[PDB]
């Protein structure tokens with residue numbers, strides 16, 4: 001792809017983080033802690049899952065960023081509406097305001113309803129995310145495999161400002177402690 005020139009500097013919004021997350025000083029990395037991280041509760045925090053939002057809000061234009069997923073067993077990545085539900089149980093779907101892909105149990109899937117199987121020959125260590133607000137497109141690229149396309153959501157109905165979306169996943173297995181990292185431009 002040739003989307004690299006729309007690169008944006010994403011930082012994580014601490015206030016939105018699940019209370020077990022640990023965000024680095026530079027707000028560019030996030031991992032699952034082994035306990036509650038001693039923060040107060042607020043209406044922004046994702047309560048049921050290890051999720052956090054980017055601080056940036058996008059309502060126009062073309063945006064691109066990259067995320068490192070090295071050695072993780074489970075994660076979700078993409079964008080979501082600023083107005084998504086924070087509390088309780090919900091599924092990742094465009095109807096609920098999410099445009100995402102994930103890794104779970106050795107398979108990659110797009111967060112449609114129902115979910116769509118992805119066809120990835122080279123397991124990615126870094127993912128590129130491209131948003132074209134006006135076109136209604138969210139695309140995912142395999143940076144490990146020369147930028148090959150993973151998935152395109154088209155005909156998106158964003159219906160609001162968009163925020164970068166992250167889920168570091170649970171670590172019930174002891175094999176999913178590694179962080180998500182926003183990669184340098």
Ligand SMILES: Cc1c([C@@H](C)NS(C)(=O)=O)cnn1C
Pocket residue numbers: 018019020036046047048049050
């Ligand atoms: C839902 C959950 C957590 C984190 C992600 N949520 S919480 C309770 O900190 O809001 C840890 N164990 N469980 C079962």
